[PDB]
């Protein structure tokens, strides 16, 4: 069995710095015919892979010169010099010297940047949804770094647990920030038994927590 191993699994790198991704195969990728069929693909968030480097060190058309591969035999490296925000995603090495073609397990390139505070917005339930018999309250934290963020819900000043879900985007391809949604879901009848709905956000970018709220019916 031909194993391709990538290290590291995740690589955090600052903008303008060099990223270095290692790929090691369990057997030599030098083909008896003379060629070394080791390639690199990039898969960005939600997308199909794209062809990056072929036969160790050759860039595919349109691939900038800041990407460069090297190595021989069993050990290879992709170097991204002067990293940019658009270089975010999972890098995969691949071999097709031996049947069958195989991929390494991927390295996720993460961008390190300066702390950035979230913009916070609260959304009450639509009338349409309340008529359906349920109530979702949505809190948005937009364009922040780092990913770590604490979001609390208070309903009439009582701390809520167990009735909210969070979701976080991938890092933004232009400014390397994240955004997050917190959704508090309640039955319409529970919803209508209280007046004040507040979400409180604690984050590295904020010197003290920010609360957004609304009073029901207004």
């Amino acid at each position: 069995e031909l194993v391709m191993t990538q290290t590291p699994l995740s690589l955090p790198v600052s903008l303008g710095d060099q990223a270095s991704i290692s790929c090691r195969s369990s057997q030599s990728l030098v083909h008896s015919n003379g060629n070394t069929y080791l390639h690199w693909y990039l898969q960005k968030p939600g997308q199909s892979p794209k062809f990056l480097i072929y036969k160790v060190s050759n860039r595919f058309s349109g691939v900038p010169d800041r990407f460069s591969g090297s190595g021989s035999g069993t050990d290879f490296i992709l170097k991204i010099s002067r990293v940019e925000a658009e270089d975010l995603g999972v890098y995969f090495c691949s071999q097709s010297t031996h049947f069958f073609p195989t991929f390494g397990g991927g390295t996720k390139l993460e961008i390190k940047r300066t702390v950035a505070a979230p913009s916070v917005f609260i959304f009450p339930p639509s009338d349409e949804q309340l008529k359906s018999g349920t109530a979702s309250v949505v809190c948005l934290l937009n364009n922040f770094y780092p990913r770590e963020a604490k979001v609390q819900w208070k309903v009439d000043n009582a701390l809520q647990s167990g009735n909210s879900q969070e979701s976080v985007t991938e890092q933004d391809s232009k400014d390397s920030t994240y955004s997050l949604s917190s959704t508090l879901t309640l039955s319409k009848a529970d919803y209508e038994k209280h007046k004040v709905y507040a979400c409180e956000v604690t984050h590295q970018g904020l010197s003290s927590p920010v609360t957004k709220s609304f009073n029901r019916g207004e």
Binding site: Q43, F51, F92, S126, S136, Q165, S179
Partner: protein, 219 residues
């Protein structure tokens, strides 16, 4: 340009058969390999096999000998992947990829086709407005959105203003509720002064339930 456009998402029951397509354009179809690659959730890419369109011959990786077949419709420049006797391990995104045999690589890929094997029937989403944060007369930025609630399976597609509004948009990953159903929100930020001029419609498409909804989002 070279393009590989695959067919849409599928929901199937265990034991059924799914056939996925990949329409090629922009090159001599018969002169390049057509490869199929599997990506299960959170997983590395797996090469499944290829079909040689020059000769009609199919070759499979060890794990893909049995329930898997490849077909070609050369006149239609379309390649097909068929999976019979569907199992839960088959829930994955499947990619077609053109093989450039002169350096033995996969130079162009299709966009992916998502297949969910489940005993459960599809459920279409309800779409609700997340109404603008501010009014015009106090300026700056305003957030607005759509809540896409209670559907199965993944994926849904959300656009804004029929694809004309893309800047400032964040469609969040889906999350499961204890109901067994997904929900997500899609939000956009805009100048609060434009809420009085510009209308905002999120367009939601859940193909497995044939749900298409356009929802106007206002104050």
């Amino acid at each position: 340009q070279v393009q590989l456009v695959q067919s849409g998402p599928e929901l199937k029951k265990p034991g059924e058969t799914v056939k996925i397509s990949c329409k090629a354009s922009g090159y001599m179809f018969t002169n390049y390999g057509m490869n199929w690659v599997k990506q299960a959730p959170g997983k590395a890419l797996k090469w499944m096999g290829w079909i040689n369109p020059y000769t009609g011959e199919s070759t499979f990786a060890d794990d893909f000998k049995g329930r898997f077949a490849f077909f070609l419709e050369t006149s239609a420049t379309t390649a097909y992947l068929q999976i019979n006797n569907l199992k839960n391990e088959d829930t994955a995104t499947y990619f077609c990829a053109r093989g450039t045999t002169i350096v033995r690589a996969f130079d162009y890929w299709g966009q992916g086709t998502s297949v969910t094997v489940s005993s459960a029937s599809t459920k279409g989403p309800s779409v609700f407005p997340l109404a603008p944060s501010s009014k015009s007369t106090s300026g700056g930025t305003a957030a607005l959105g759509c809540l896409v609630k209670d559907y199965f399976p993944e994926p849904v597609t959300v656009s804004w203003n029929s694809g004309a509004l893309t800047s400032g948009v964040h469609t969040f990953p889906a999350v499961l509720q204890s109901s067994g159903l997904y929900s997500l929100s899609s939000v956009v930020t805009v100048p609060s002064s434009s809420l009085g001029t510009q209308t905002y419609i999120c367009n939601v498409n859940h193909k497995p339930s044939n749900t298409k909804v356009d929802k106007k989002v206002e104050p």
